[PDB]
Amino acid sequence: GAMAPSYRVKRMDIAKNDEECVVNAANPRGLPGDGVCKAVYKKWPESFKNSATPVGTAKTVMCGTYPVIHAVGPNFSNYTESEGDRELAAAYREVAKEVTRLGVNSVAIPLLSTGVYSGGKDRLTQSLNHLFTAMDSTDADVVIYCRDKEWEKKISEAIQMRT
Ligand SMILES: [Cl-]
Ligand SMILES: [Cl-]
Ligand SMILES: [Cl-]
Secondary structure (H helix, E strand, O other), X not given: OOOOOOEEEEEOOHHHOOOOOEEEEOOOOXXXXXXXXXXXXXXXXXXXXXXXXXXXXXXXXEEOOEEEEEEOOOOOOXXXXXXXXXXXXXXXXXXXXXXXXXXXXXXXXXXXXXXXXXXXXXOHHHXXXXXXXXXXXXXXXXXXXXXXXXXXHHHHHHHHHHO
């Protein structure tokens, strides 16, 4: 655990993170995918051996000794708002279990279901709040990675609001 567990946000490629492990915004089939998933595939391709896992779950695969936590959020194109919300909350609880099990002091995490799985909706607040709900009881330093300057500001504001 970190001495004073924190949340931070950075606007950069999660493939360049400075944390002890990474959460992939994975697809259920362990495919290279698009966006964060493709960057993770390019950086840690070894971590996609038997990484396939159901929606609402997380499966960790080691790239050397570096843990890649494959977290499968729902594709809101396919799920109802209600069932999608439940699966998105569940994927983050599974991430918290994995981070805890690994005993890491830090984790790099993207906002699940906010890109091509968003179903064309802004889900920053929905995804971030599920991340907080899962990770608040962990003592890892959490570093949220995003690519948009306005999302960076909104995530930074949400973190600071609670401090
Ligand atoms: Cl970058
Ligand atoms: Cl996504
Ligand atoms: Cl973003």
